């Protein structure tokens, strides 16, 4: 059947905003995963997982009698899709069980690993999510093999449909770089937001860049992709060498023996794929990657044998039975065990990407330190494994269960505990009046609270107004945040705060994070008053102020809004149309299409635009909360045309006289063009909609202010 | 960005079941359009519509000073997408304002028509939907031009995103037949469920079949497509001749002057399209279809001039100024007015498809009767226009406002009024006990009630258990309904009914429609008891029994289930895979994916399969309500393979011994294969889910039993 996407392939897709409806979710509307998990007997689950590790199933026999390496790979891949650029991917929604990830070539045979876990998932039911189980199983694998993990948190709720992620524009799995949809340009610059070198890979190609087996060049791709997953050189080396202490790769015959990935397989395969015609198709005859390497002399036990071998041998370029490039130790004895035949031994082998850890000069220094000091290696790997598997969980308030690490880590963007009484409703009313009496305007108050709260993204639950990091580097200097204007507002609010806090007894105080939010609430109430409407905007106290020393400035860079349609802002000139960037932002804010439409039309008339731009300010009563954006945009008495200076800026002129009435950008005018967004704009632009517009604006403003409030969940 | 649909283009799409979530809808979840409409000042709206008729806007000037013809075409096209095969399309959801229908070539310039209505829509807001406004406007246009309509009902709630409809597989707008994706095969056989001859047309091609100007062959296409829109020969002739009494076509210059359709146009177009470079691009210069025909001497007034012209001249083939085929009256004088210049007159003209009404011998006889008896033509056209514009509205209980016709029409599948006391809870308990004492089994009771209720489709709100039409022709004879089994159940039920009704006082009686549904509820209660669960299934009385004379047997044929996955039934071997047909059926029943999952898994173990087929009966306790279907389908101890006899039946064998344990169809096994359906099956097959399964099944059963109960809404 031909679809709208077929006819109009470039038209904007609003379906990304309407996933996760209560329709698609089999659990009741009142289901609370955290409540279920908190009563899980986690120790019993781990005892079951420990038993599974050495209980081989004949349909996918265990290498060395132990599934631990397979499960570590499973958990690593679940987490390894994460990109810092947008926060998308990662292990936090259990997306490896859905398309496309369930069928990426790098996930081959993890379908078998997940099937091995069905009996335990079935036993525990709703009290452990697939998402949590996949990570837990990797931790139990590590523990079972002698490695002390840093800890584990539950709380990843399951999802029920595929996430909408841009994974690249190639139409061929694993396509080498430089094709018509190349993800590389310039001097090997990978396009943002991508974090893998080839479509369907987790990070890098194990044979080397585009298949060229050069460890020094491979190291470049490792460093770039791991940095795009938030890992530095020490963490990178720890992870790779730590992982490759365990298990083996699978390449026993040619890859042409392997059939369809799971999403392409026949119905009889019952959700599995990569069925192999090579010999028994499994076990000793398995084919996964096509490589055939076993890294250590004890693949089922933690050791420091990976670095002993990497540094203790010289390496020769060789081919696996499937034809893939890999390396074997020159002159070595057969010291590596075979996975099924106790009478066979093999020489040490390595991937090109393993040899990167020795031939790249900066990695070599770390690797040598880890070789000489294996305790340092173990601690770095434990810490990096925790970070990897938790990076997208969000604030520490979301962490559940008895094994949560007590150490607070800088990468968690930590928020101090609150140790004093909070303001009550009468205090909040007193503070809103003080804020309005200061002379701060509706535009100032709205713009500041919007800047603080709108850094949130639901993909990895980073950002938001909690912390008051807007006052700190780097947020206080972002161009979108209007740094001189911001400084002036924050000075005024900090004086209000000092005066209120100095007058209290009993230790009650207000944080600056809460006062920034409350001040924005006062601005919205005042704008409603300016329109003739008395409303109260909800406010929940309890945010705390983080320090500069508790803030990693480099990690915060990815949260800079370079396109924020809600403030009519674009930092530079981009390939992707601005309207598509607005819908991307709305999805990170967790907004529906109706919510995005109300919010933007309100912000326009409140004065939230960066630079006091008049684009989209379709009112003669700025700083009053009215529906004038929608009534004016939809007025057929105005004709619109792109300007000669800039095709992305439009003039609205009276159709009869030619008089200039307005200007707007693509972000403004999409609401009068897109057939679905225009239908929404019509509801809010109708003669009966003033009350509705106000109510719905207040509700979506309060939603945005609370996005990071997992302390109240 | 490459998507899952790109990678796996034949995989099943479950998003069709989760449209219309509260997420995409701007109105609150409690908004009730019927309540809003019932307080609209309908008379005020009609005065405004009357004013609009002759208020010409310079950006799309009115032909003859009166927009009535444009508006009639607008309303006709809103209704004209309807297909009796699935009930999809039609005016009832206002879908002409969304993709793709807003941009079909046959809807060209109806963007202008709908934009002319924005000020009225704005003024009345949520109290009149777009869907009702488009029909009301057509009615007012007719009234304004001197034609008395049969009536009007409101109640078409607006929708907020495109409907998922199969419109064909062609990849080229208007493609002629016989291409790679041809909708025709054999002797001009149109593929079900389509009801138009070319992609982007409403019914037929005005130049003739595939552009060949043969009125006799055109007639064949008109008859077939109108029958597929529920119209017979008399209704067809009345509608075409009635419509073409008014207005004109637009073809003033070559079609190459017309630019992008609305969904392709630039942002500055603000939702309009087909901008024309020909002269002024509008009014006298308009280009819509490419034809240049004006049918009557008074295009803005009801007349009997259509048939006077059709019969009063002989016709010559000619070309419009765009090159399209049309007909002109031989030796006529210039009697037809010009739309803009009072000094120009034109000869009478006709389309090929108008000439069909004279040169097809069965239409000729109707046309002549209408020409000789214009009162008959007027009444037929009024009735047909009502039917056209109301066909998809469902039972008369949904009809709102002060202009609803009192006459009950056969096509409405009428249900008699209930005029007696209904059974109460103590009566329902007595009847359930009598049903269970009769010896009717769980399988018989479930299967019968399922057969009665599951004819409902939400697309046109036809079908369901109200009316007890299961006892009448043709439902009692459908193969899916197991006619001999059904007769025996009905005989037993009608004897229960007779005995209960004979024992009452005060006029109380139970209908057979109610008893069929109540008996099914007793079967579900009994099956829960058989599993050790105490369950009460809700029941709402008030259904009535319709007569055979209230049941048009030909119109009922389209409701016959030729695929019903819920009963593991397929009537024949089809091109579309059976799991796609199950999702299609789920969508007509208004079910979400979780609801479809629970329902199907329960029905399998209750014995609802046609012919007592063992396919998908994955239990050793048939007729007990358990989650066995899920637990056994997901057991990895079983391996599945298609049979040699039939690739569409699968055998599930013990993996270790080879022994046969079960058989299933594609409909059974998709729940273990599709990655989203299997995630749902996992929830219900977990060890904690037996109670959840029973409660969820009861809810979805009740849902299906009440789909047609608009008497309770
Ligand atoms: Na994420
Ligand atoms: Na319909």
Cβ(B433)–Cβ(B425) under 8 Å? Answer: no
Give dist(CA A268, CA A265) in Å, integer.
Answer: 8
B161 CB near a chain A CB, below 8 Å? Answer: yes
Handedness of CA A86, A92, A96, A100 (dihedral sign): negative
Chain A residues in contact with B268 by the CB 8 A cut-off are 640-642, 650, 669, 673
Chain A residues touching residue B199 (CB < 8 angstroms): 2
* Dihedral sign for Cα atoms in the order A226, A229, A231, A232: positive
CB contact under 8 A, B268 and A102: no
Distance CA B600, CA B582 (A): 10
* Residues of chain A neighbouring B597 (CB-CB closer than 8 A): 26
Phi, psi of B337 (to 5 degrees): -70, 155
Q: How was this structure determined?
A: X-ray
Is A650 strand, coil or helix? Answer: strand
Instruction: Using the structure block, give the residue that is written with the tokens 């005016």.
Output: B91
Burial (CB count within 10 angstroms: exposed 0-12, middle 13-18, buried 19+), residue A430 = middle
Residue A438, token pair as written in the block: 């200061």
Quote the minimal CA–CA distance from B26 to chain A in Å: 5
Give yes or no for a contact between A599 and A704, defined as CB atoms under 8 angstroms apart. yes
Which residues are CB-neighbours of B459 under 8 A, at least 6 positions away? B86, B87, B88, B90, B392, B588
Which residue of B636, B642, B686 is in closest CB contact with A115? Answer: B636
| Cα distance between residue B359 and residue B352, in whole Å | 10
Tally of residues, chain B: 713
Helix (H, G, I), strand (E, B) or coil at A53: helix
A680 touching B (Cβ < 8 Å): yes
Question: Angle at CA A79, nearest 5°, toward A40 and A338?
Answer: 95
Is the minimum CB–CB distance between A39 and chain B shorter than 8 Å? no
* Segments of B144-284 assigned E as strands: 184-185, 189-190
The tokens describing A270, both together, are 């019952």
Q: Closest by alpha carbon to B172, among B105, B242, B102?
A: B105
Closest CA to A360 of A218, A534, A507: A218
DSSP per-residue string spanning B394-412: -SGGG-BSTT---S--GGG
For residue B651, give the H/E element and its range.
Answer: strand B649-654
Interface residue B644 vs chain A (CB under 8 A): no
> How far is it, in rounded angstroms, from Cα B179 to Cα B191?
14
Nearest to B24 among A98, A162, A592 (CB): A592
Ligand approaching nearest to the C-alpha of A86: 1
* Residue A84 CA to ligand 1 centre (angstroms): 9
With residue B425 as reference, give the H or E element that holds it. Answer: helix B425-437
Alpha-carbon distance of A679 to A594, in angstroms, equals: 10
Give the Å distance between the CA of B163 and the centre of ligand 2: 9
Phi-psi label, residue B239: left if phi above 0, alpha if psi -120 to 50, beta otherwise: alpha
Q: Is A294 on the interface with B (CB under 8 A)?
A: no
Residues A221 and A442: their CA atoms lie apart, in Å, by 48
C-beta neighbour count of B429 within 10 angstroms: 13
Tokens coding B460: 């046109």
B144 with B51: CB under 8 angstroms?
no
Q: How far is it, in rounded angstroms, from Cα A16 to Cα A148?
A: 40
Token pair of A121, please?
Answer: 């998932």
Ligand nearest to the CA of B87: 2
| Residue B597, helix vs strand vs coil | helix
Q: How many whole angstroms separate alpha carbon B609 and alpha carbon B607?
A: 6
Helical (H) or strand (E) element with B332? none
Write the burial class of residue A34 (CB in 10 Å: 0-12 exposed, 13-18 middle, 19+ buried).
Answer: middle
Closest CA relative to residue B538, chosen from B524, B550, B556: B524
- Here the tokens at position B443 are 């399988």
Q: What values do phi and psi take at B313, rounded to 5?
A: -125, 160
Q: How far apart, in Å, do the first and last CA atoms of chain A sit? A: 44
Strand order in the sheet with B649-654: B638-642, B649-654, B660-665
Compute, in angstroms, the gap from residue B135 CA to the centroid of ligand 2: 15
Angle between helices B352-359 and B305-312 (to 10 degrees): 80
Beta carbons within 10 angstroms of residue B232's beta carbon? 13
- Residue B602, both tokens: 């329960």
Pairing of strands B315-319, B189-190: unpaired
Total Cβ atoms within 10 A of residue B322: 21
Q: Please check whether residue A200 touches B, CB under 8 A.
A: no
C-alpha of residue B87 to centroid of ligand 2, in Å: 5
Q: State the resolution, in angstroms.
A: 1.7
**Chain length of chain A:** 713
CA distance B470 to B485: 12
Backbone angles phi, psi at B103, to 5 degrees: -125, 10
- Those residues whose C-beta lies under 8 Å from the C-beta of residue A372, and which sit 6 or more positions away, are none
CB atoms A25 and B102 under 8 Å: no
d(CA A594, CA A602): 12
B408-419 in b/e form (b: 16+ CB < 10 A) is: eeebbbbbeebe
CA distance A465 to A457: 12
Q: At what angle do helices B305-312 and B233-243 cross, to 10 degrees?
A: 100
Cα A129 from Cα A151, distance rounded (Å): 18
Distance A203 CA to ligand 1 centre (A): 16
CA contacts within 13 A on the Cβ side of B477: 6
- Distance between CA atoms of residues B99 and A12, nearest Å: 12
> CB–CB of B693/B630 below 8 Å?
yes
* Chain B neighbors of A683, CB-CB under 8 A: 26-27, 125-126
Question: Both ends of chain B: CA-CA distance in Å?
Answer: 44
Domains with residue ranges and CATH for chain A: 1-167+373-407 (1.10.520.10), 168-372 (1.10.420.10), 408-564+689-713 (1.10.520.10), 565-688 (1.10.420.10)
Residue B405 tokens read as 């016709």
Strands B325-329 and B315-319: antiparallel
Q: Do residues B136 and B49 lie in contact, with contact meaning Cβ atoms separated by under 8 Å?
A: yes
CB–CB of B363/B357 below 8 Å?
yes
Give the helix/strand (H/E) hosting B380. helix B374-390
**Helical H segments across A233-373, by residue range:** 233-243, 305-312, 352-359, 361-372
Residue B65 and residue B551: Cα distance in Å, rounded? 46
**Please, are residues B475 and B486 in contact by the beta-carbon 8 Å criterion?**
no
Q: Report phi then psi at A177, rounded to 5.
A: -65, 155
Q: Is B636 on the interface with A (CB under 8 A)?
A: yes
Alpha carbon distance A45, A123 (integer Å): 9
Chain A nearest-CA distance from B323, in A, is 26
A593 with A657: CB under 8 angstroms?
A: no
Helix (H, G, I), strand (E, B), or coil: what is residue A557? helix
Count helices and strands in chain A by DSSP H and E runs: 24, 12
Cα–Cα distances in angstroms (integers) from residue A224 to residues A188, A554, A558, B5, in the given order: 10, 15, 15, 30
Name the pairing type of β-strands A649-654 and A638-642: antiparallel
Q: Is the torsion defined by CA of A160, A161, A164, A166 positive or negative?
A: positive
Pairing relation of β-strands A563-564 and A569-570? antiparallel
- Supply the DSSP string of B473-492, one letter for each residue: TTGGG-GGG-HHHHHHHHHH
CA distance B368 to chain A (A): 42
Taking phi over 0 as left and psi of -120 to 50 as alpha, with beta for the rest, A658 belongs to: left
What is the rounded distance in angstroms from the CA atom of residue B293 to the CA atom of residue A141? 79
Q: What is the CA radius of gyration of chain B?
A: 28
| Residue A319 in tokens | 């081919």
- For chain A, the maximum distance between any two Cα atoms, rounded to a whole number of angstroms, is 94
Could you tell me the two tokens for B556?
A: 């009922």
| CA–CA gap between residue B203 and residue B106 (Å, rounded) | 9
User: Do residues A205 and A265 make contact, with C-beta atoms less than 8 angstroms apart?
Assistant: no
Whether the link from the prior residue into B554 is cis, omega within 30° of 0, is no
Q: Are A352 and A327 in contact (CB under 8 A)?
A: yes
- Phi (first) and psi of residue B108, to 5 degrees: -55, 135
Strand partners of residue A545 = A467
B557-to-A356, A698, B127, B408, B476 alpha-carbon distances in Å: 71, 52, 37, 21, 12
Residue B61 is classified by DSSP as: P
Helix (H) or strand (E) holding A662: strand A660-665
CB B168 within 8 A of CB B181: yes
Q: Across the interface, do A18 and B23 touch by the CB < 8 Å criterion? A: yes
- How far apart CA B142 and CA B247 sit, in angstroms, is 11
The shares of helix, strand and coil residues in chain A, as percent rounded to the nearest 5, are 45, 5, 45
**Which whole-number Å values give the CA distances from A526 to A103, A495, A523, in the listed order?**
53, 21, 5
Alpha-carbon distance of B85 to B228, in angstroms, equals 7
Helices (H) and strands (E) in chain B, counts: 24, 12
How many angstroms separate the CA atoms of B195 and B558, rounded? 13
> Is A244 a known ligand-binding residue?
yes
Helix (H, G, I), strand (E, B) or coil at B353: helix
Per DSSP bridges, beta strands A660-665 and A649-654 are antiparallel
Q: What is the distance between the alpha carbons of residues B80 and B102, in angstroms, rounded to a whole number? A: 13
How far apart CA A27 and CA A129 sit, in angstroms, is 12
d(CA A82, CA A16): 19
> Catalytic site residue A77?
yes
CA B240 to CA B245: how far, in whole Å?
Answer: 9
Contact map slice: B 105-134 vs A, CB within 8 A: 115, 118-119, 121-127
Residue-wise DSSP of B509-553: ---HHHHHHHHHHHHHHHHHHHTT------------BPPGGGS-H
Using CB atoms within 10 Å of the CB of residue A250, give its burial: 0 to 12 exposed, 13 to 18 middle, 19+ buried.
Answer: buried
> Alpha helix (H) ranges present in A589-654?
593-606, 628-633
Closest CA to B466 of B551, B541, B545: B545
Beta carbons of A246 and A69 less than 8 angstroms apart: yes
The answer to whether the beta carbons of residues A295 and A349 sit under 8 Å apart is yes
Task: Judge whether B265 and B259 are in contact, CB under 8 Å.
Answer: yes
The secondary structure of residue B349, as a DSSP letter, is: E
- Cα(A461)–Cα(A559) distance, integer angstroms: 11
Give me the helix-helix angle, B690-705 and B512-530, nearest 10°: 170
Whole-number Å distance between alpha carbons of B244 and A327 = 81
Closest alpha carbon to A596 in A676, A651, A690, A686: A676
Distance CA A605, CA A626 (A): 7
Note whether A203 and A190 are within 8 A (CB).
no
A686 CB-near residues (< 8 Å, 6+ apart): B121, B122, B123, B124, B125, B126
CB-proximal residues (5 Å) to ion ligand 1: A 88, 90, 392, 459-460
Residue B645 has which token pair? 């006899």
Closest CA to A439 of A395, A488, A396: A488
Nearest Cα to Cα of residue B284 among B323, B257, B252, B256: B252
Measured between CA atoms, how close is A154 to chain B, in angstroms? 19
Secondary structure class of A95 (helix, strand, coil): helix
Structural element, H or E, at residue B113: helix B110-116
The 8-class DSSP code of residue B248 comes to B
| Residues on chain B touching A115 (C-beta within 8 angstroms) | 636
Q: What gap in Å lies between CA A230 and CA B132, rounded to an integer? A: 54
Q: State the burial class of residue B532 (Cβ atoms within 10 Å of its Cβ: 0-12, 13-18, 19+).
A: exposed
DSSP letter assigned to residue B627: S
Tokens 């996949």, located at residue: A134
* Paired strand residues for B316: B328
Q: How many CB atoms lie within 10 A of CB B273?
A: 21
């Amino acid at each position: 059947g031909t679809s709208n996407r077929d006819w109009w392939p470039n038209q904007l897709d609003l379906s990304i905003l309407h996933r996760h409806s209560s329709l698609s979710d089999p659990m009741g509307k009142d289901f609370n995963y955290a409540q279920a998990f908190e009563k899980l007997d986690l120790a019993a689950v781990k005892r079951d997982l420990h038993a599974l590790m050495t209980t081989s199933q004949d349909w996918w026999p265990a290498d060395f009698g132990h599934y631990g390496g397979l499960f570590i790979r499973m958990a690593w891949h679940s987490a390894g899709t994460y990109r810092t650029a947008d926060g998308r991917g990662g292990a936090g929604e259990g997306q490896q069980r859905f398309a496309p990830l369930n069928s990426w070539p790098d996930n081959a045979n993890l379908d078998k690993a997940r099937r091995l876990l069905w009996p335990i998932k079935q036993k525990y039911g709703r009290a452990i999510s697939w998402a949590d189980l996949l990570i837990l199983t990797g931790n139990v694998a590590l523990e079972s093999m002698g490695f002390k993990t840093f800890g584990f948190a539950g709380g990843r709720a399951d999802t029920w449909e595929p996430e909408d992620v841009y994974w690249g524009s190639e139409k061929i799995w694993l396509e080498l770089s430089g094709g018509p949809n190349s993800r590389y340009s310039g001097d090997r610059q990978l396009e943002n937001p991508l974090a893998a070198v080839q479509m369907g890979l987790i990070y890098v190609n194990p044979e080397g860049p585009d298949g060229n087996p050069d460890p020094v060049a491979a190291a470049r791709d490792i460093r770039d992709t791991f940095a795009r997953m938030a890992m530095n050189d020490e963490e990178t080396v720890a992870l790779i060498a730590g992982g490759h202490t365990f298990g083996k790769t699978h390449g026993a015959g040619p890859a042409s023996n392997v059939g369809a990935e799971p999403e392409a397989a026949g119905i009889e395969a019952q959700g599995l794929g990569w069925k192999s015609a090579y010999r028994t198709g499994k076990g000793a005859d398995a084919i996964t990657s096509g490589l055939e390497v076993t890294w250590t002399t004890t693949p089922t036990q933690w050791s420091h044998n990976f670095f002993e071998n990497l540094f203790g041998y010289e390496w020769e370029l060789t081919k696996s039975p499937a034809g893939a490039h890999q390396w074997v130790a020159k002159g070595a004895d057969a010291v590596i065990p075979d996975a099924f035949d106790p009478s066979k031994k093999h020489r040490p082998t390595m991937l090109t990407t393993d040899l990167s850890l020795r031939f790249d000069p900066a990695y070599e220094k770390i690797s040598r330190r880890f070789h000489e000091n294996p305790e340092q290696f173990a601690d770095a790997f434990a810490r990096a494994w925790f970070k990897l598997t938790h990076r997208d969980m969000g604030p520490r308030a979301r962490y559940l269960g008895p094994e949560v690490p007590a150490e607070v880590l800088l990468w968690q963007d930590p928020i101090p505990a609150v140790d004093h009484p909070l303001i009550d409703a009468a205090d909040a009313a007193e503070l809103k009046a003080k804020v309005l009496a200061s002379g701060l305007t509706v535009s100032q108050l709205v713009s500041t609270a919007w800047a603080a709260a709108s850094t949130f993204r639901g993909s990895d639950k980073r950002g938001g107004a909690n912390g008051a990091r807007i006052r700190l580097a780097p947020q206080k200097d972002w161009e979108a945040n209007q740094p001189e204007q911001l400084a002036a507002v924050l000075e005024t609010l900090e004086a209000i705060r000092t005066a209120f806090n100095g007058a209290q007894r009993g230790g009650k105080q207000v944080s600056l994070a809460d006062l920034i939010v409350l001040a924005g609430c006062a601005g919205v109430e005042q704008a409603a008053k300016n329109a003739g409407h008395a409303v109260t905007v909800p406010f929940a106290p309890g945010r705390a102020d983080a320090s500069q020393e508790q803030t990693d400035v480099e990690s915060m860079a990815v949260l800079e809004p370079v396109a924020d349609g809600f403030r009519n802002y674009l930092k530079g000139k981009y390939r992707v149309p601005a309207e598509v960037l607005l819908v991307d932002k709305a999805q990170l804010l967790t907004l529906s299409a109706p919510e995005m439409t109300v919010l933007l039309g309100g912000l326009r008339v409140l004065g939230a635009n960066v630079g006091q731009s008049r684009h989209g300010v379709f009112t003669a009563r700025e700083q009053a909360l009215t529906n004038d954006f929608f009534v004016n945009l939809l007025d057929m008495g105005t004709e619109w045309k792109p300007t000669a200076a800039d095709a992305d800026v439009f003039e609205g002129r009276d159709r009869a006289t030619g008089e200039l009435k307005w200007t707007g950008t693509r972000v403004d005018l999409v609401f009068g063009s897109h057939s679905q967004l225009r239908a929404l704009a019509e509801v809010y632009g109708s003669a009966d909609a003033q009350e509705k517009f106000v109510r719905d604006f207040v509700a979506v403003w309060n939603k945005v202010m609370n996005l990071d409030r997992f302390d109240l969940a």
